[PDB]
């Protein structure tokens, strides 16, 4: 507060001031132009190529047992796998569901032959292997090992030959120059190797005579032809149905189908936002040439497929497709297939690498969303504020006429004296006067002229604590008027409260009564409340559902662990340096 | 900087001020319930238990002794299982094992004697030390090779009884398991005889399994010891019931303060502590529906009580018995309401991010809506409040107030409690002249309070007399008069500046820029939140994680299987 | 609307009121102080130590072949790998690039010897292994397998010895007490084991004689060549000191502009470029307390300097020495402050950086909204204080209206100096109020009332009282508002819910407020709420896709391969 008093000499043209005129208020931004569309999002494909294959091989075993007195002991059990020749796969196994009891094949640069039970060759029926949970189908000919008849004090050999046929899952990873079987065996030939148109261009690490391709092939299940591939390796023969590389594999995978994908141009790039998955992708304005995608023949297909299925299910009756689907590369390695729409209301080759984290895009979407909202609303507050200030000037132009000192003091920033000199305002500073130098007189009446009373209290004061006593009249807000003119006709029931210092001086019947604190008068406010509080600090702690360790441990068997342990066997349970001689 | 003439308004057009609008009200406010919660996630950890392996390393070498040397012609190596009886009576009961092996290998009952000597029981001594390895025990430590007999082939046998303690792991549905050695055991770790245990899975003949009640583990309390003898070994592990041993769910987070609220037919569980907000249907999730999840009810209470005591026992009270809800993302929430005293498997996502974004978004949303709502309300109140001032201001200067409210220069005058307005006519600045004297030539001591003017509506029109009003208004009636006074100084708005007069005599025009300006405006400087781009960011990429493994099985196999193609001939056949 | 009339008795000092004086407005917070700086963020290293090694071994094979009359059959094929002796590697392989056609080594506690083709030992020239995609380099001496010469009705043995030398990649994980080769072969010796200064302290599970270290070795700069001979092979690799060689941390992010600030007794490192804010204590982290983390200080400086040069050398100056802090989540931060010219342990890092991006995002928005709304609150307080001055003049002009608005109910008011005396007005039913037809004063020609006359009763049965219409439906008890009768008299007086129109000082008719054009004194503001939004779970790759990304699954291959006998053979049957 300022319970300090003031004297305000009449202002002279010395200083003149004018009110600032209306400011040009801001205008609301044009507004973003969004394009309704359907989108299909693709990601780098990390899944291997999977296809069915059949294995044809024979387990060949030759035991050596020495029959001692009362017992017999294995001296050695030689085991090996032999590939079933093409001819035999075609004419025996596939044609008749049978297999020879002999195994003739090349091993260690030598053609070796093995007869089951060691006797004359005979065709054998393939029978279902023994059931087993979570396993493919298998078939074999024999089920018992063949050991030599006993002959004491002698070493004898026995040959076993179990013809085995197994259907197995096959897998291949880019660039598909080789593949693996579910048994752990690698095949160093492309799953797409063949003779038909350019196929022979694919990779193969085997001599020509090891591979065979049979057209219009029919398989027998122990109804359409297939081009059947047949590769015979040193340990087995493997077959699979040949299909062309390009309409089969893809370096991308469909990831998200988005009904409502808004697109907008902004600072040289497109923003693709999906309210449904709370994501915003960013791309250049120029489409990405789909043909540049190394083996991505599934994208166009998949997008069209999904795209039409969505159009029908949701826009066929309210919008129209605007042009051909477009393709864009988003930051993070996401390929977006986009189909613009519009409501009727109007009427070198390379591989894309994708990030495993979509968080940046969700943060982008979230941030953009809040940002847009706060800039929009606070922007409106600003415009409304400016407008209100401009509007207010009109009221101040009228107030300044009724009370120039008060309006000027508020506007100038300090207690001043003022008066209108036309359309401008002349002002002069007022001089402070210590409260202890001001005396309020007991009477407001004028004996001089009966019936006439002063309208406000009379006073006596001095500018300096030692200075002379000057008489005047009390004005508003502690102003000391040098003239005692404020008068009126004495009235009955005279009651008044005048601002005096930090409280009021009360008069009744034109006589001083007493002073008081503002606390004795009830207060009413002209102010409109507004309780704004700050958004408080918040801390985000690291948080994971599963740690890399839990994940590493989610696997039943750990190859590294198993190898580490198993290879310590000798250092643990055996001597390695002792040379017995 | 345009002049206007405003004719007296006629009842022609009458306007009124809009009255106070109904101001918005603050929304009710969300009701939150305090509570304790435990969050479960899909269990991806393998069932783990200890087991012992009993088997013998059977080796039989063949050596051909040359004159100046000796050379191996072959080295048969096999693994023979140790018979039940021998583990029971010899290993478990004595800590010894036979120096011979007899088992079924390739549909034949083979038999081997260590050193090829008579059967002897042998001392099982601890295996040689090795870092990060379980405990092991064996009998022999050397390989027996036939004594030299130049020019002949000879076969020598070896038998090293080995017992190993090893970790066992099994994954749902637990119908089989594996050992630290990589050996699979196709029998449920919970297979047995005791109540329904025989129901479990097994792929062996009844006579390969054996259960020993009240067994007493030897060490080179009772347990219902299980023993399986496989073609290459025998393994034993303590039998325990299935249900109280495994769980398809895992405790993930313990939450002291988990607020719950209901909106739009869903429950929102948010944790300030971990900045997460889960969402669920209002209906609880039948904990009984959880395939093998008896650990849930357990862990939950355990934790909820520990927390209750540690933090709310002295200030709040539990309400009802714990509830269970299925949240989006596959998280199971055990919830325990509080109050101030005052059959299938659940699949869980590996990313909690959606729920934290949810929490973050919700928290900010709540705040801006709350505050901007208060601003909207206060703005409406202020506008209504101001009307009272406009009502007084209009009686004082109708033209000005009406012009601001109407939006264009108009004329106005009150007609009771309503305002009559009429449009004003613009006048080119060049068609306006200010006369030099404000004094009245026919009445002594009487002066015009405001400057007189001579103008013409049209550039060719007659010259009209009148006096300058405020804000460039041209008054047709020169009735603004006052007693002439001494020291007369005045500045009148004229065009885009002021016309200065002294002692009722024109002096000169000035620019507003020549006069000091003071503002009646309260400033406010709002700036926009600027654009921000978030780039892709990962601590470890999936490639780094793949490389984190010491050995890669695919890589190893890929390379090893190329051996013959790289260092040998796979096609050439020799005949002679 | 109100729809109710009021009689307002003259106020008596009974109740007096004053306006609240200006409130002290809030002040703008000081404002956060940010230190510009360069940073380098490190994470726990999950990558194994990698180094090159060379393998020396020999494929030894002894086949047993029985020569039938028309055919031939392998009776058994013994295959083994033999380590190449130190001496041979040195003097034969490394020296002349050849190898012995013989394999002498220890197997199963016995020293066996093998002669290729079962012939006299001869030095053989090593040759490049057959070409193969994505494979290291290898060399061998023989291409074919040797088999016994044909001899009908006889068992025969043939020996093949193929000397093989392969350059392979080696890998080792902390504590580095052992390592593996690309072949899957484990080597239980520290890649750092040796003789030179404390090396012998490193781990090793082999007898001293198996190991050999050759200083000043060749193969164009000498090296300390290690050579370990295991039961199945001999491996060599250039020795290097452990300390500088391996690291338990990995440089992760190089940040040009990393702002640092402190609050609540903690440091905040925020990067606008990667949208991340790290949190740490005010106390540096002893870099030396980092187990084997010798790469940190080096990499930090290399990076730090490169960046300073490229971006701040011409406008900023380094301040102090590089400082190091540990951030929540297990991130080690190397920080270099700038200014314009104007026991021991291993850090464990989280896999998810999201908490830190959320932190940054939230702080950025929080900072912005608190700033602007805070400015709104200040401007609002100032405006409320500012307008009191207008209210001070208004109250003088229309005390009843200004007081009614400030008091919150219809009251009567008058100034008693600088305070306001007020009294409550009494309501009157609209049906108890009658507007006279004339505003003319018969008993005083030329004199007319400026506002309509009325009659009314406080109660539906009470006497009828005379008076005149005031503003906003006030019923004044004194018919004193008079004026000079004039021409073309036109007036609209608020009456009930609308107006009463008077012409030529004569009642004409009443009308709805709808008959008059409405203009507004209100400034509009259209604020709308930010709407609810649901974030659904979303992953690029599920953990199952990741699991499946591996070409061969060991668990799957083992599970299946061990079911061979159970599927294609009888395990329980003795004959
Ligand atoms: Na003005
Ligand atoms: Na306020
Ligand atoms: Na009004
Ligand atoms: Na006041």
Assembly type: homotrimer
Biggest sheet of chain A: strands, sense, closure?
Answer: 10 strands, antiparallel
Total count of domains of chain A: 5
Secondary-structure-based class of chain A equals alpha+beta
Largest interface: A-C, 139 and 133 residues
Number of helices of chain A: 7
Percent of residues in helices of chain A: 10-25%
N→C terminal distance of chain A: 113 Å
DSSP E strands of chain A, number: 36
In this entry the ligands are:
sodium ion
Based on CA atoms alone, the radius of gyration of chain A comes out at 51 Å
Global morphology of chain A: elongated
Strand content of chain A: 35-45%
Main location (chain A): virion
GO molecular function (chain A): identical protein binding
Subunit structure (chain A): Homotrimer; disulfide-linked. Interacts with host receptor MYH9/NMMHC-IIA. Interacts with host receptor MYH10/NMMHC-IIB. Binds to heparan sulfate proteoglycans. Interacts with gH/gL heterodimer. Interacts with the host coreceptor PILRA.
Family (chain A): Belongs to the herpesviridae glycoprotein B family.
Describe this protein's structure.
3 copies of one chain form a homotrimer. Chain A has 581 residues and is an alpha+beta fold. Chain A folds into 5 domains: 1-8 and 431-522, SH3 type barrels; 9-33 and 355-430, Single alpha-helices involved in coiled-coils or other helix-helix interfaces; 34-47 and 248-354, Roll (PH-domain like); 48-247, no CATH class; 523-581, Single alpha-helices involved in coiled-coils or other helix-helix interfaces (Helix non-globular), CATH 6.10.250.3280. Chain A has 7 helices and 36 strands. In chain A, strands 4, 5, 10, 11, 12, 13, 14, 15, 16 and 17 form a 10-stranded antiparallel β-sheet that branches. In chain A, helix 3 packs antiparallel against helix 4 (404-412). The longest helix of chain A has 44 residues, at 359-402. The first copy, chain A, is elongated. Chain A starts with a strand and ends in an 8-residue tail after the last helix. Chains A and C meet through strand 4, strand 5, strand 8, strand 12 and helix 3 of A and strand 2, strand 4, strand 5, helix 4 and helix 5 of C. Strand 2 of chain A pairs parallel with strand 36 (516-518) of chain B, so a sheet runs across the interface. The structure holds sodium ion (4 copies). Residues 19, 392 of chain C line the site of one sodium ion. The site of one sodium ion (NA) has 2 residues of chain A, from loops. Chain C: It is found in: Virion membrane; Host cell membrane; Host endosome membrane; Host Golgi apparatus membrane. Chain C: Residues 1-575 are virion surface. Chain C: Disulfide bonds join 8-425, 25-381, 99-163, 247-295, 448-485. Chain C: GO terms for molecular function: identical protein binding. Chain C: Glycans are attached at residues 33, 281, 313, 526.
């Amino acid at each position: 507060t300022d319970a300090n008093f003031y004297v305000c000499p009449p202002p002279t043209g010395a200083t003149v001031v004018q009110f600032e005129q209306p400011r040009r208020c801001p205008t609301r931004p044009e507004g973003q132009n969004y394009t309704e569309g359907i989108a299909v999002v693709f990601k780098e494909n990390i899944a291997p190529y999977k296809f069915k294959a059949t294995m044809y091989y024979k387990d060949v075993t030759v035991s050596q047992v020495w029959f001692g007195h009362r017992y017999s002991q294995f001296m050695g059990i030689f085991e090996d796998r032999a590939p079933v020749p093409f001819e035999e796969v075609i004419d025996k196994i596939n044609a008749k569901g049978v297999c020879r009891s002999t195994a003739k094949y090349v091993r260690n640069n030598l053609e070796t032959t093995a007869f089951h039970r060691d006797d004359h060759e005979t065709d054998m029926e393939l029978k279902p292997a023994n059931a087993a949970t979570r396993t493919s189908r298998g078939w074999h000919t024999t089920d018992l090992k063949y050991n030599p008849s006993r002959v004491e004090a002698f070493h004898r050999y026995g040959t076993t030959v179990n013809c085995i046929v197994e259907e197995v899952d096959a897998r291949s990873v880019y660039p598909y120059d080789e593949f693996v079987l579910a048994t752990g065996d690698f095949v160093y030939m492309s799953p797409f190797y063949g003779y038909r148109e350019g196929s022979h261009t694919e990779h193969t690490t085997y001599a020509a005579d090891r591979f065979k391709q049979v057209d219009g092939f029919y398989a027998r299940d122990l109804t359409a032809p297939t081009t059947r591939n047949l590769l015979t390796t040193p340990k087995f023969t493997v077959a699979w149905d040949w299909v062309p590389k390009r309409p089969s594999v893809c370096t991308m995978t469909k990831w998200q189908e988005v009904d409502e994908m808004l697109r907008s141009e902004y600072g040289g790039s497109f923003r693709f936002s999906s309210d449904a998955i709370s994501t915003t992708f960013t791309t250049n304005l120029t489409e990405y040439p789909l043909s540049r995608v190394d083996l991505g023949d599934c994208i166009g297909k998949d997008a069209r497929d999904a795209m039409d299925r969505i159009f029908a299910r949701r826009y066929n009756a309210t919008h129209i497709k605007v042009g051909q689907p477009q393709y864009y590369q988003a930051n993070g390695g996401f390929l977006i297939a986009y189909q613009p729409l519009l409501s009727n209301t109007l009427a070198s080759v390379e591989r894309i690498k994708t990030t495993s984290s979509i968080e940046f895009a969700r943060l982008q979407f979230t941030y953009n969303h809040i940002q847009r909202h706060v800039n929009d609303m606070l922007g409106r507050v600003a415009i409304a504020w400016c407008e209100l200030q401009n509007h207010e000037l009109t009221l101040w132009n009228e107030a300044r006429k009724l009370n120039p000192n008060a309006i000027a003091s508020v506007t100038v920033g300090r207690r001043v004296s003022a008066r209108m000199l036309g359309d401008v305002m002349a002002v002069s500073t007022c001089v402070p006067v210590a409260a202890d130098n001001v005396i309020v007189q007991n009477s407001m009446r004028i004996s001089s002229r009966p019936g006439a009373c002063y309208s406000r209290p009379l006073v006596s004061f001095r500018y300096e604590d030692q200075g002379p006593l000057v008489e005047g009249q009390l004005g508003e807000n502690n102003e000391l008027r040098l003239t005692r003119d404020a008068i009126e006709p004495c009235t009955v029931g005279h009651r008044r409260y005048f601002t005096f210092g930090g409280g009021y001086v009360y008069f009744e019947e034109y006589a001083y009564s007493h002073q008081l604190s503002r606390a004795d008068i009830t207060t009413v406010s002209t102010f409109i409340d507004l309780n704004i509080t700050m958004l408080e600090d918040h801390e985000f702690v690291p948080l994971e559902v599963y740690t890399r360790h839990e994940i590493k441990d989610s696997g039943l068997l750990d190859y590294t662990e198993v190898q580490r342990r198993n290879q310590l066997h000798d250092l643990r349970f055996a001597d390695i340096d002792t040379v017995i001689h």
